[PDB]
Amino acid sequence: TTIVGVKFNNGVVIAADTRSTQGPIVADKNCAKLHRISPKIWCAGAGTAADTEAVTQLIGSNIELHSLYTSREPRVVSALQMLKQHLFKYQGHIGAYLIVAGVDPTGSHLFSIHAHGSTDVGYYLSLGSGSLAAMAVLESHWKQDLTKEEAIKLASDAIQAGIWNDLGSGSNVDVCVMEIGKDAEYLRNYLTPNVREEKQKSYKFPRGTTAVLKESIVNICD
Amino acid sequence: MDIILGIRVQDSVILASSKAVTRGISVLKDSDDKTRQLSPHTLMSFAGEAGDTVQFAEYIQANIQLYSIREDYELSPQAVSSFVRQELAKSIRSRRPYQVNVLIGGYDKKKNKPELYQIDYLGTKVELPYGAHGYSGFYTFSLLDHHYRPDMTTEEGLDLLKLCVQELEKRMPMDFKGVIVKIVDKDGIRQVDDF
Amino acid sequence: MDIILGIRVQDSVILASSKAVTRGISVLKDSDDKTRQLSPHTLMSFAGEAGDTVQFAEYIQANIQLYSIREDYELSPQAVSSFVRQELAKSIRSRRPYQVNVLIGGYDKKKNKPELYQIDYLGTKVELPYGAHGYSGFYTFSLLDHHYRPDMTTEEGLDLLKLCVQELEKRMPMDFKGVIVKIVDKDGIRQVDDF
Amino acid sequence: SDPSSINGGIVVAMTGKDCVAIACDLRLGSQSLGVSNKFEKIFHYGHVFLGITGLATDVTTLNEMFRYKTNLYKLKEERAIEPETFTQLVSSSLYERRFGPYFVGPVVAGINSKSGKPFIAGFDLIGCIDEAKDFIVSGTASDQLFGMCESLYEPNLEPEDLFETISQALLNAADRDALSGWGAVVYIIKKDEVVKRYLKMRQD
Amino acid sequence: QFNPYGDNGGTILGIAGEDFAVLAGDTRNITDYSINSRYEPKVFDCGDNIVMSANGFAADGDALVKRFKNSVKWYHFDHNDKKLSINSAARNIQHLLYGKRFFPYYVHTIIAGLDEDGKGAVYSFDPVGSYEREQCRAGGAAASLIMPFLDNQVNFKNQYEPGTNGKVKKPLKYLSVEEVIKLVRDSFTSATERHIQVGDGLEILIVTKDGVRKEFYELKRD
Amino acid sequence: TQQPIVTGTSVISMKYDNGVIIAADNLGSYGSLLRFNGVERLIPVGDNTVVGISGDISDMQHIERLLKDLVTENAYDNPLADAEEALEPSYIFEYLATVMYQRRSKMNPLWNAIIVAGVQSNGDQFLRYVNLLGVTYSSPTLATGFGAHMANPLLRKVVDRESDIPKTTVQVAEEAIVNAMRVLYYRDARSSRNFSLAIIDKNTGLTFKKNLQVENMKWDFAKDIKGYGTQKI
Amino acid sequence: TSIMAVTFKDGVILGADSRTTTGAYIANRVTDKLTRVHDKIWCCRSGSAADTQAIADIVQYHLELYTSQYGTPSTETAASVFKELCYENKDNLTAGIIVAGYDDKNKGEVYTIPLGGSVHKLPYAIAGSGSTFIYGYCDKNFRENMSKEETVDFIKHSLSQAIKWDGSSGGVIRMVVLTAAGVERLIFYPDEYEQL
Amino acid sequence: TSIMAVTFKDGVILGADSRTTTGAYIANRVTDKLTRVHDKIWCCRSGSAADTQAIADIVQYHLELYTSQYGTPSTETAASVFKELCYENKDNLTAGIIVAGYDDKNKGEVYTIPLGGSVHKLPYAIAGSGSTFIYGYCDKNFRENMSKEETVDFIKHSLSQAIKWDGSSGGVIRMVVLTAAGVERLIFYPDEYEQL
Amino acid sequence: AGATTLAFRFQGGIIVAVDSRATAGNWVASQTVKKVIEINPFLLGTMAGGAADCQFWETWLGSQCRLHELREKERISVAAASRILSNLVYQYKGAGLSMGTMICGYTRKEGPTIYYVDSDGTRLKGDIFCVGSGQTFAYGVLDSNYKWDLSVEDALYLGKRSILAAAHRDAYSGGSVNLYHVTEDGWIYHGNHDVGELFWKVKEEEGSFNNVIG
Ligand SMILES: *[C@@](C)(CO)[C@](*)(O)[C@H](CC(C)C)NC(=O)[C@H](Cc1ccccc1)NC(=O)[C@H](CC(C)C)NC(=O)[C@H](CCc1ccccc1)NC(=O)CN1CCOCC1
Ligand SMILES: *[C@@](C)(CO)[C@](*)(O)[C@H](CC(C)C)NC(=O)[C@H](Cc1ccccc1)NC(=O)[C@H](CC(C)C)NC(=O)[C@H](CCc1ccccc1)NC(=O)CN1CCOCC1
Ligand SMILES: *[C@@](C)(CO)[C@](*)(O)[C@H](CC(C)C)NC(=O)[C@H](Cc1ccccc1)NC(=O)[C@H](CC(C)C)NC(=O)[C@H](CCc1ccccc1)NC(=O)CN1CCOCC1
Ligand SMILES: [Cl-]
């Protein structure tokens, strides 16, 4: 994985690639690494795939119940605190590396969380196997007072750096924009620069090619 | 090493189990019966880690006998095999698993059919026409694959079984001191005294 | 597990060696002769690491045969045993030692006496009335200690040897597929074909 | 001593035009030794199909478990479970054993009875969902299946064409794997009919 | 402790026709999750209409090729410019590999060319020198992905004649150079999708009685 | 079997239209200790080649001696030593690559990663890498250590393939290298601010720049960063 | 890390670098290692980022609950809570913490808590991987009852050298001043401190 | 060990502690780690006592044979002979040596040779386990072209701090002065240097 | 690695039968491997264990056998040929060679002869030998059906049927069957037989493998 987060004027943007690996094999060419914790708090996940999904759903569930209990819109620091204390308790065995971002009544926020439970604050962050390729871009092109359109460009460029240069990352670029006073816009497959070219030949077989021993109707009804 | 074989024929199930019990460089016994009657028409042979084998077999025996008394009814071989599999499936993730492999030969009185189930220590169940555990199948399966017919009689099954034991006695490194053979059919369980 | 036995009686030396050759879970052969004639009145049986056994035995055989031709004279069993011991004594401190244990049965024509020498792979030589290598002595020595008399005949020695093989066949974990028996006396070396 | 490659086996699933297909080999072994050629790895709970590869005791155990859970689901909900919902149930159940997992590679396949949309999904042993438009692979010849499916597959295949594609993907993958083969089964699943075909393959 | 071996990834493919033979290979060179080069050739013209590739550990692969090229040169000096036949080259390469039996070249070697009857020939070697002549052979990282596809499309395995109850096999036949390159291109684009170490470029060397021709095709760079 | 003691970090390089650029910082680390600060890791050979070396510094000094001795030996009985029969980058590289592979095959490696940058006699750019394993590869951009992870992605945005080389000027290429060295100073814990840079052009020849510093850094935003999550002060 | 806390005439100043590492990669170059556990009780964190964060969060919770019941806690009390956590969980923690605070009665106080969980009250303390290189410098240059400006220069020069020699230390120099006046945050950038 | 060599106006001064350890036991508290390989080429020895002695003895032999044939060797030449031994036998040696010498042409020169066998020519050098604690102090206090008395004080204060913090360093401070005037040995005892 | 190789002596000479599969773990590398090495027109060798070790040294053996008959003007005995090979590998013992082979030949003074030669120095003369991962399966068919007075036709089938037995059960054995008949005048190749087609054919004609649906 490559994942990033970038702060801008009136909010925050996060992005991710869409490759899922199983050893040297690409298991999913278009997997979703951007997770919704609450409507305006989203999370980018790297590391152990099941752990990032499981931990983000658990905290998201508890955040919802908390939001209902307190009659308030959830805060990013609450998700951050709940996540890090959960991860710390499991001493890094839950391999979730997250970039947590969102907007709440306090403002716009951007954090990262590591598997062992350490958190960091920043205007621009990157995690995953392609974090170095992404961070190289962020360190080269980031500046203070970015606009919405500039932040999306920078974030996607950082993900592209991972896609092209890191073998752990690939395929497409997902983006989520969280602006203050607005609904969060989840941009699934914001870029698709890895479209498979037309095949040279069709491998549709003549019917009856496959040898068959037995046929039978399966009963799915009651 | 501990040799346990099983053959399901037309009207019966035949189980053959080695008689040797070895500990270190000494054959302590040469007449050991590696089986327990679970119910009048169900027999289980076993092989594996010392102590675990008998402890497990008798624990199963007690549970099936308890069921028989409670319901005044004999459980089907399929039902018994499923119960046994579950116990081994629980065991494998325990603190100290039962290292026991079993064959379950039974005659289903409702279906009027013989049934042979092979279950390893992991809880891996399969219904088979013929089965074995350990290295035993490495020698015998080629013979069974060849000569085994599904419509065989009990006598034909015993002759096929003799062929397997002869091959084991020829090519296996150890002396397993022959086998005790038992037959399971509609009339219940009986032992072949001369083999 | 390779069985080699030796018994020195009044007028001869008797060597008994197992016929099995096992590799993995398969008995590759059941008629293997684990011995070499070093000279007309000297016989050496052997057991140990695969390959090393035969390679060593034949190397010794060649050296003794070379001596016989050079001097037109047969070396005494004592002299042959000392030569063999030295070769093993050299071997144990080599880069790759011969892992071979041997018994040397011979009839000294000058003394008119049978002689049995036991030499392990370290080069540990002993002259004995009866000897063995490996686990074989663990079973048989109690029988030999009891029934062995120094004035026995060759026929009495063979009956005593039968008693040992029977005990091994009863209590040893593996099947060693019987033994080839050879007798060394004043008239030379001969094999007992029916044992 | 690698639990996921002791027994061997493979499962593959594919989508077509208003249909899905799921197929599996029939081998069950103990490492080098072939033990059974009738060990089916595909199960169904109502109209939802589940293939499972990996450790055979866990395959059997999980089938019994999901049969348990889908029967109770039906009694309380008064309706059969859908593929999307079942997929989440499988994921939840597997992650429950996160630090003592079932050594399996399950595959869900089916058609939603309400929307009519074809659905397939794959999982890792701790419940990570791998949803896909095209195909899902699992087992000891997953590498081989990825290679066949990625070249042979095309979108919107008719049931009769889809059958040939999935069958060829499985057969040729199985023949390049020692621990897979010994027979094969293919399920062709339409909205209200399901056909099951046993394939003829080499038995070595 | 010092490990003298490495894995430079990559995958190669040799197919033999009736009067021709091809030896393909991707141009990507990697270490772990990094790309070292997007274009680093590893299929070479060694003279006498022999093409060769030694895939795996690139340092050993370059050494072997370099030694074989040198072997071809000295074969000419010592035997009056005699042409080294493909079968003679194969046997020579066995001795090169087996000469380091106890400190092996960590490579999978494939050579291609024409035999002495003018017919297409491919030979494949294990790291220690066992070799075999074959119609079809994939080597390297994605060999497991490519090879079963070739079995199906080149050797027509598991394909039976329609309507014949799976009794009559689909008949073996020689493919054209055009049909073979189609299979090569589709083999590598499929492997590129699912294997992270495969991509960037595809270079094919085709061998006919006329000589050695090259063809290059781009692959996905993610 | 070795273990590296005093080490040098990344060496980065790229091709441009008329030549090549190579750079490396002036640090000799002793584990986590930044022990030596006046270490030159770019070593020119003649007026057309620069060898950039990372890894063990004692082994680097050995290679310096080999290259210096190579120039001496080439001049022996060679009237064209400063002309047609002068040392080429390809000759110098193949020599080192031969040595590196021989040493790994004796299980006694030179614990280095080397990049040989230069211009051939026919004007062609030469850029090739070799390491302690004897592994070799060439690319429009090459980098060792952290540079491979962070610099290559930035340099490949300028020259992503072969066709981008004639389109890339020396001004643009130098700018990218200098930018990359700044990023390495931000993110590599065994890097220094001071570095050397060398340009080998087919027209203007060899330009060797010493005592360069990373500048135009962004640190101001650090003042706004407080705590690790909840802390407001 | 390089961290230090120094008592002086008007109170105490905490100092730290801003580098966070994963092997040789700098995961964060603008880290804040000076963390508040109470209004005028702060700590310098070294060792595991996860462990030190978890500890500081628990201490902040304990001191907030202490304050609700018993009023403002002493710096010694804060150090005792840190110690209790570090000592009782010594087998599972990697945390080198310096506790610094300002009372009106006790003035500036500094307590250092090494790996084992021992407590040591000192006039000044240095810790972290980069502290090794400045034991000599700090010992020769430290004086009691320094002024604010002298103390700032002392910390600046000290951490400048620690950063210069330690690869595991770098970035900016953060400082937190604790006096009766209040809480002042300071920052110093590379271009300034490097050429000292 | 704590050792150092410092160039100055009139030449170079070598400095060292006198402690030799076996674990935590001090096997020799009055060790002489400053050893002559030529009239005005000396070395500071750190690491294995056996290895450094064997090396210095071989170098002294090489430089004696050099002198018989080619006249007085340069300090660079002496450092090269040390390097050759340390580099080619790096797998079997544990020796951190500083080579210091006085030429009339080149004046005072200092070469340091770390574990790997690399050579580094410097204005001054510090080495040994105790050097870690004075990197900051020495960097801040070293100046080029110091006087003899200034250089003696610099070494004295530096090794005083190294000894103070390093358990593997202690005893007396030995020094050797190399100038055109000749060779002067100096010694400084605990009662003097400890209370600096 | 995985393999099933056999060789047995009988009235009409020697039958040699092998499988064709090569595996690198679970991955099936090849189905077309040659596990009979044609040392010369009169001598055959089987491949089990290291493929390279068997190929290289049994080819080398043929070179030594050719040199023997050039110097002695007489065919080399199977005893002497097997001995050259076993003495050679014994020199390399401990280095890591992996070899389990049957050296097969038919001469005047010896008759049909088989020597099992192995990488740890073993050299055994015998009538029947089976080597490889599927050796146990093949032994069972061989032992139960073997007789000295077998015909050449029946002996060839027995060797073919024995490999099939192993190919079926042993995962690391299969692909195809290669048959050879060794006579005093030289060996005769009896074709390549795909196990896929051979299995179904034997099932139908023989009535065996009822456990398998077809
Ligand atoms: C980039 C792509 C990699 O750096 C990203 O970080 C992504 C993150 C996204 C998808 C959330 N990471 C992965 O894709 C991740 C990489 C990985 C692999 C192994 C351990 C940690 C991280 N891949 C996965 O998590 C896959 C997801 C599958 C493809 C749906 N899962 C596996 O590879 C599992 C690992 C499960 C696991 C168990 C215990 C501890 C840690 C992880 N492995 C397998 O399934 C392998 N094998 C299959 C056959 O059955 C036996 C198990
Ligand atoms: C200086 C750097 C050293 O004294 C400072 O002390 C700072 C203190 C600040 C940040 C509070 N310390 C670190 O930066 C600290 C160094 C460290 C590393 C390991 C153990 C103890 C201390 N770094 C970390 O804690 C990082 C922070 C992450 C990158 C945000 N975490 C890791 O390096 C984790 C920690 C795992 C761990 C191991 C042992 C004890 C506790 C935690 N390690 C990894 O992620 C593993 N990593 C994988 C890649 O290979 C390198 C190791
Ligand atoms: C300071 C102390 C460290 O930098 C100095 O460098 C001095 C240098 C002077 C004396 C030249 N170094 C030592 O005093 C040196 C420390 C040391 C120890 C081990 C390896 C390298 C350096 N001490 C020694 O060399 C002593 C001298 C003896 C006591 C006279 N020797 C040992 O400690 C020997 C050395 C064996 C050895 C091990 C590895 C590499 C080289 C040599 N060790 C022992 O006798 C074992 N001893 C047994 C009791 O348990 C503790 C270890
Ligand atoms: Cl932190």
Ligand SMILES: [Cl-]
């Ligand atoms: Cl000393």
Ligand SMILES: [Mg+2]
């Ligand atoms: Mg198969």
Ligand SMILES: [Mg+2]
């Ligand atoms: Mg090799």
Ligand SMILES: [Mg+2]
């Ligand atoms: Mg790819």
Ligand SMILES: [Mg+2]
């Ligand atoms: Mg620093």
Ligand SMILES: [Mg+2]
């Ligand atoms: Mg001291």
Ligand SMILES: [Mg+2]
């Ligand atoms: Mg098979």
